[PDB]
């Protein structure tokens, strides 16, 4: 279940933050598990129940008077600001970073993983407030791509002098 440098993010791509790796999706697909992206539904109703509607969220039926259909987080997650975060990360603030689960402490622990250029600060409750360094360890094998710091995360992007084509995602 761990996302490693060898993981293939299906219909997606890997990104790295100061203390972990995660999968992001191509176009407007959504994560259904940590390594799989799928086409999202635009409306929840009877015929799309249990279909992906967002990252780690699916359409569910809400019984009542009237019956409704909503997009609710998968098991293990809670909706905070309309985003599915792990239960153990409920109301955890990391500053320049995000809360994640620690498969180094395999006991269900919420830790802070920080934007590239920041590291956890032991003086600030392990928040992402200490300027710091992270080594990119992404492979980036697709031709004319290398690891780059984009928007505070490491990802495979087009070599210097090259521009990504929007329609195909090919570096030209």
């Amino acid at each position, epitope marked *: 279940g761990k996302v490693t440098v060898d993981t293939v993010c299906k219909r*997606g791509f890997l990104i790295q933050m100061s203390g972990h790796l995660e999968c992001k999706c191509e176009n407007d*697909l959504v994560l259904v598990n940590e390594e799989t992206c799928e086409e999202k539904v635009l*409306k929840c*109703d009877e015929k799309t129940v249990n*279909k992906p509607c967002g990252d780690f969220s699916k359409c569910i039926k809400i019984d009542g008077n009237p019956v409704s259909y909503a997009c609710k987080c998968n098991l293990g997650y809670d909706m905070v600001n309309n985003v599915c975060i792990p239960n153990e990360c409920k109301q955890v603030t990391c500053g320049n970073g995000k809360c994640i689960l620690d498969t180094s402490n395999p006991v269900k622990t919420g830790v802070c993983s920080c934007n590239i250029g920041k590291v956890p600060n032991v003086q600030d409750q392990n928040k992402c407030s200490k300027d710091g360094e992270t080594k990119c360890s992404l492979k980036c094998l*697709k031709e004319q791509e290398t690891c780059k710091a984009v928007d505070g995360i490491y990802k495979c992007d087009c070599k210097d002098g090259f521009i990504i084509d929007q329609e*195909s995602s*090919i570096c030209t």
Partner: single-chain antibody
Amino acid sequence: GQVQLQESGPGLVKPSETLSLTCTVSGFSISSSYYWDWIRQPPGKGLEWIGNIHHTGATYYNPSLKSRVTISIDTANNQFSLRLRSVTAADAAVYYCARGGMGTTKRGWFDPWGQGTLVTVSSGSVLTQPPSASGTPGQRVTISCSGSSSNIRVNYVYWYQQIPGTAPKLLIYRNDQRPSGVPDRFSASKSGTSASLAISGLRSQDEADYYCAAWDDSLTGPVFGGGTKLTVLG
């Protein structure tokens, strides 16, 4: 570049064999943000989507075929293949490969299409369209496409024209928009769960099969209409 697709396959398979097909993509890297789709057409029926693969290995299959179908991709040689097991006479058809778009704005968009390979077998639709339409030169004809809340209402509709002997070709994209080269006498629209294709100024060059298509969120994949065979009289 000049993306082109070409199918290779057996011409004849025996019942219970596994049909094997291969699509070669040229002028373009298969390691791109697209789906690589297999679609088939029984010799006198409509289009049926079989499945697709992404270069990361993720596959989508038609549920009705899931138990018998495997699609694989070979990025080093820019190829992708179809395996269909326990072939029966019902599997005889023209098989096409195509490049399908990803995401809400492009899913259901197939361009370019392969020429198609005929598969014969030896011995031993979700969207509804009128089966046929007819008119005389100069008239306007309309072709209906009735769907549901899971495909037409929430997903973009696409129209494809198949001149006899040729592969389907994109005629209309994103409900009402014309690809360069299709004249404006071709129009299309969508309302609720239904869609319509209007052809003005009918001429003999229009005689062809017309198919609507849209991604279905219930089945998780593209669905085609049964097709309308437009005949021009005189």
